[PDB]
UniProtKB/Swiss-Prot annotation, chains A, B:
Organism: Arthrobacter globiformis
Induction and repression of expression: By phenethylamine.
Binding of substrate, residues: 288-299, 371-376
Name this protein carries in UniProt: Phenylethylamine oxidase
Enzyme Commission (EC) number: 1.4.3.21
Amino acid sequence: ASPFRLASAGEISEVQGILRTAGLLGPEKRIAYLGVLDPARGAGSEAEDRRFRVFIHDVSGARPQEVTVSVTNGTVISAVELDTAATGELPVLEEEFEVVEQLLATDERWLKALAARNLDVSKVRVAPLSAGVFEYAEERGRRILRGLAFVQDFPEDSAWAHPVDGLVAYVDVVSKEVTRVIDTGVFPVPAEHGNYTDPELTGPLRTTQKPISITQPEGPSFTVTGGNHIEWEKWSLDVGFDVREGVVLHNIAFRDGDRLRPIINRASIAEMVVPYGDPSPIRSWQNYFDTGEYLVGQYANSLELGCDCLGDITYLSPVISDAFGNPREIRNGICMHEEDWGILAKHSDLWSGINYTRRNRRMVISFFTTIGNYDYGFYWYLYLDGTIEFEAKATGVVFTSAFPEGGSDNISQLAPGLGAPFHQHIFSARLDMAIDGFTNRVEEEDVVRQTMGPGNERGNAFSRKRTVLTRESEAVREADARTGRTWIISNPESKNRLNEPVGYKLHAHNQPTLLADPGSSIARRAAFATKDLWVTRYADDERYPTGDFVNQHSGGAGLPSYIAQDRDIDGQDIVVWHTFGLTHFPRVEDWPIMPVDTVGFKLRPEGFFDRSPVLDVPAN
Amino acid sequence: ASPFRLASAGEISEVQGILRTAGLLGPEKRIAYLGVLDPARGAGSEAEDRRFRVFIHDVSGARPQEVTVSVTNGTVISAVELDTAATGELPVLEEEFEVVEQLLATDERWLKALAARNLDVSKVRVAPLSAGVFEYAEERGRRILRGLAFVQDFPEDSAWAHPVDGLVAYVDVVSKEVTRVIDTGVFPVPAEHGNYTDPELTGPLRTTQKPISITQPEGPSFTVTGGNHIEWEKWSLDVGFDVREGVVLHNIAFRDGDRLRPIINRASIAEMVVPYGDPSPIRSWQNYFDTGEYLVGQYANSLELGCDCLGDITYLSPVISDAFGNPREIRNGICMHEEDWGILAKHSDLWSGINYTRRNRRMVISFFTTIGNYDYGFYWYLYLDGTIEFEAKATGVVFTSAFPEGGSDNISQLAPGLGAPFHQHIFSARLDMAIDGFTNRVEEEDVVRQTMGPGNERGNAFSRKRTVLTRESEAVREADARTGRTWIISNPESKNRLNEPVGYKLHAHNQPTLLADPGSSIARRAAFATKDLWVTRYADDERYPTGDFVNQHSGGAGLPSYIAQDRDIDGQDIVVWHTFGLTHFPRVEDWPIMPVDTVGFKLRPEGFFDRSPVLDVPAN
Ligand SMILES: [Cu+2]
Ligand SMILES: [Cu+2]
Ligand code: NA
Ligand code: NA
Ligand code: NA
Ligand code: NA
């Protein structure tokens, strides 16, 4: 009955039927995106209407469409033709990936380039990459992918070990034309293999690791109701899944005595960009918007018990649409479990004689996605003490190139002749805040150093200052680790027992933001990534920091255009957008498969409760 | 047989006998510090000599002594009388703590102050705190403690809830004289209790938490030999224990094929300071050097199975000396165990068809100490992939004051009338490096942004720069989170298979350093805490960043005096000193007992290995 329930296979089948009957899903059409729309603000009328948003691509070159459907009523609500030269192309389709390699295999220029390198075309894999927007006027309004080549010596070989540098091609995937083949010169193809399951590379496997057995003899402490509603240790939330964003958390609330207190209305990773920092023309266009261009949810892994998720695991299997509107289940795509998390609180008191220890735990909600060579884990954590944390885990195989003789300022060497270009992995968390309700504000908190003198005669005092962000034009903020800068989201109309506004503090990791020149194409298309924190006034249609149609969009859409409205955010329905990421200079230890590295953020209560919220945790 | 073995009870008993026979341990003497000396450089002669360093206090006012003893030979090696007005006082003795409250109970000024507040002297606990060095000329060369008062309503009451503000006393603990009683005015004593085991405060305990059972059916994967030598998943190290520093790690090495490769010769937390930022004269002198003044090892907790350490736990019970030279065992003072640590590496490859997942784990070595109201956990972690990490966990009860009517810029309000002064908790990690041997150097690595233009026509390139620190005078460095600053410790004479020097990268958390005015007493005594990174040339006698005798030492000793030697550190035997800490603005949720907060650092391999070191981890 809950409006936040996961999409069912029956809903998706109904959407397909509604589109087909309306004449919108002929044999030339493909569904590039399908997802449920969240309820609009003020849904306290119970008048549920399950609506789906659909992007429809046409493989014959006709204009694509954006369509909204009500499965409750069985009707098309609206259908708009899209001018993609203006508003951006649709996300890349899984079926377009294979088109690139097949088209290049019959192009005379491509074959001549491979022949010069004595490579068998049957052994050459082509990575199909998003194109971005650069200097090529003929690409405006066309669906382009760019291809980079790797050699696979045999069917089980890791092609990433054998990049074909000096060569790139551009492909129009609708007209099925190779527009350009660029050959800047022959580089040796690195010859060492990177097969991390080959015994010749691994050596004998270790026999020293003894089992760690994690079990829950009475079952887990959380309950799942209505398919996706979780209650755990005073937390309450709904676990959503969207094919673009992946796991989405709704209605995060905490049961404080007899009050269910809201904290976050919607939390998601709303974009993630991977920009490459190699100025070679073979790769200087390379920027992945994994969320906006590729849709990270549709490549979610099925997670295996004992290997991917260890312990007493509860799975969710979300349903998405394939390109024809058929429902597809991602079996065991989301893992949920609780974990011991060390000591929560401890004190041995000399005067009272009381020794006190309590243990912490966290609830984990995670999924893993694979986009070509990279694999990303998305982890949401809820702690007993009210802390909320996100962590991204980056692994997989690094993207490779030749390593030039005489070295490089922009590429690491991993093996003889094998390079890995510098790059970043940058995420945008969209936090639609609801601290004790929807009237919220953001304050920036800095440490304040004080000078020795009157009133501070021993020169020991220090303080802090808080600055309220009152309008969107002043709500674009940068980190300052040296001054301990954090941001507090508070509710000025809801006070704790000390008559202070209740709040939550955002703690960032203070990693570098986007490094590209501010005049670059990527800085314009990924403007969100140039600043650590943005605050906007909530609006139904302001969903992504990069806009709705990211693929081949010329720039400026999303957050820079939203904040130009300069709306009041002082005690209003607000959304916090936090940029955070990893700057990756690959090391030898990242090859041939990369150990996990992590980045994230957390929010901790700041006078939200009237005292510690974990006094009622038992001794265990 | 190993020279790095823990001190035995028999060794300590022999030290006592040697001191007694030499006439150095009469009834007026107290042992303020006793610990084993590490082998000197070049101990490859097997000529083992177990030597102990002893600080001997005299309760009659005679000069204290520093003594070195050889238990192997049964001799006093050297004995030096100390001029404490010059070189500092000895660490505080546990037995001096009770002297303060007892002496004040008979002082007419103290009793008049308590009578004005209608407090029963039998209910007034006095926190005995280190004195530092301020404006009081009569304290030079005397052993002073300062006392702050708290009311205990009944024997099991938490006195911290009832600070007696406006009152402080200074006590000469040798002459047993109260030198000064300062009463700046009557503040109401906060009346709410803070008894976190009282059902009236906790409410009914939760019944919702189901058990998490962590077991190892075949036992743990590590072995312990010689009492304290650990081998685990290619790591090798010795776990030491010192009464001042606590757990010390020796001879950290990694088995790479058939070579045992050193990484760190000695790792320890060599100082930790807690400066308070309240300018009230009642507290503006308040700075704890928990390591140098109090000795954190002697207050180590006995850790309980299932509560403090969960899983298959191996304990060490270190032995220390009491004040009379008798051995005292800290039963179950160190916990050692391995922990599952999520996913290590993962890739699902479209082209090869191979799906690959491996799980990570870490070895944990920890102890917990209690100093008055605060409790600190010290955690060392070793990971499968070569990462080394330290984490401090801060909990206990925050130090309190009155909350002034009309508020404060330097104190948080926790409850009606109850304040908590702002403060920091700052640690110094001393890392005596040995990356593939002792010829090491430090490079500072910054991200480099590049301008769009020739050679970078699309404005996407970025790079990095490394600066070698060649002399101690240029080796005092500050963090810069915005430029992604890290430090690399490398061995220029040991190269990986790509002909690059092997190295390890230090990743800091980039938290604020010491906030006090640079002209303050604490900035002079804790100079190490004003900068994030120091590099010195190894020397036997340069052990602590604050010097040997921290208590009431006027300042300048330790790191600032060491680096004035301006020694060569470019490919030499070097020591890295890393400052890191927490800046604590207490929140309501920290009261009445504080949930754990954490800070730390980590070191990751940087071309130390020829490829990923965890290819031989099995599928599990
Ligand atoms: Cu990367
Ligand atoms: Cu603190
Ligand atoms: Na446009
Ligand atoms: Na909001
Ligand atoms: Na002095
Ligand atoms: Na060294």
